[PDB]
């Protein structure tokens, strides 16, 4: 009973690791969208100013 116990805590930690990796992958793309919008805003701000 004590050795069927530490088998699967590791799987739970791997599960949270997978969820965090997926969240990181999505948030990098969202940061890329925001950076692209900021980059186009700089040049349009300068031209229109």
């Amino acid at each position: 009973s004590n050795l069927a116990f530490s088998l699967l805590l590791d799987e739970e930690l791997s599960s949270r690791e997978k969820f965090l990796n997926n969240y990181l992958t999505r948030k990098q793309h969202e940061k890329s969208q925001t950076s692209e919008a900021v980059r186009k805003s700089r040049e349009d701000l300068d031209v229109c100013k």
Partner: protein
């Protein structure tokens, strides 16, 4: 000075500290009551999990029947496979609109079945977490039962 000992000949047992067979038997009775109570609580939880399994299988049955009903009006070329049951000019436009409409009810019922299956398996993950916590508890409960019974037999 000195701490409470139970070996040294200079030490004499206090008369209240004198452990007898009646004390040991009452202690084993209280331990057995604790064992039976913990086992009864877990078995009640497992019975609730079994009835929950029956309920979620019935809900998946209803969703699969609704899936067949919406697939009856669905064109074959945009079919999505049925989740398995658990065991204990104008006319073409709105025709294809009906096709993709039944496609997304198909996807919604498949995702709902997936959610129910995942949540039931996760309910089993809960109660298996409460299983090996108490399995490790009752195995030592039998171990200390043997220790007290050895103390019962000798004393």
């Amino acid at each position: 000075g000195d701490f409470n000992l139970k070996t040294a000949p200079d030490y004499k047992i206090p008369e209240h500290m004198r452990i007898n067979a009646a004390k040991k038997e009452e202690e084993l009775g209280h331990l057995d009551s604790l064992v039976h109570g913990n086992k009864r609580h877990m078995n009640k939880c497992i019975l609730s999990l079994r009835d929950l399994k029956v309920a979620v299988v019935e809900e998946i049955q209803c969703l699969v029947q609704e899936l067949k009903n919406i697939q009856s009006t669905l064109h074959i070329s945009k079919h999505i496979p049925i989740p398995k049951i658990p065991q204990i000019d104008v006319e073409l436009e709105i025709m294809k609109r009906d096709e993709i409409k039944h496609v997304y009810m198909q996807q919604y019922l498949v995702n709902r079945i997936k959610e129910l299956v995942v949540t039931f398996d996760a309910e089993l993950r809960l109660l298996r977490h409460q299983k090996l916590k108490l399995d490790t508890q009752m195995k030592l409960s039998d171990l200390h039962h043997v220790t007290l019974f050895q103390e019962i037999l000798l004393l």
